[PDB]
Amino acid sequence: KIVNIGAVLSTRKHEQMFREAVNQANKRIQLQATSVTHKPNAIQMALSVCEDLISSQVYAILVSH
């Protein structure tokens, strides 16, 4: 019952906190966190959107500035 979940984060300590919160909410129905990043890049990030969407389990993502 695992489910992949994406996000967008500038730094990767926030990504580790995000995976920690995934494991925290995994106490209740399992969860999975995919690799996230953020660049000031309108083209390469949009290119990597489908590269991270190639896994057919990411149902919801997050966006930061």
Binding site: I43, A46, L47, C50
Partner: protein, 49 residues
Amino acid sequence: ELVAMNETDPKSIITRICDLMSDRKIQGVVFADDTDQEAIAQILDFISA
């Protein structure tokens, strides 16, 4: 001059745009498709605009 490709994948179209920029001559294009997809017109507004 180009060649046609029966492909609706828009990221493939964007890599083909990078292919035309690698062909170094491109400034503007005049192209279409034999479908009714306004989503690619939105993609044009996102990228080419």
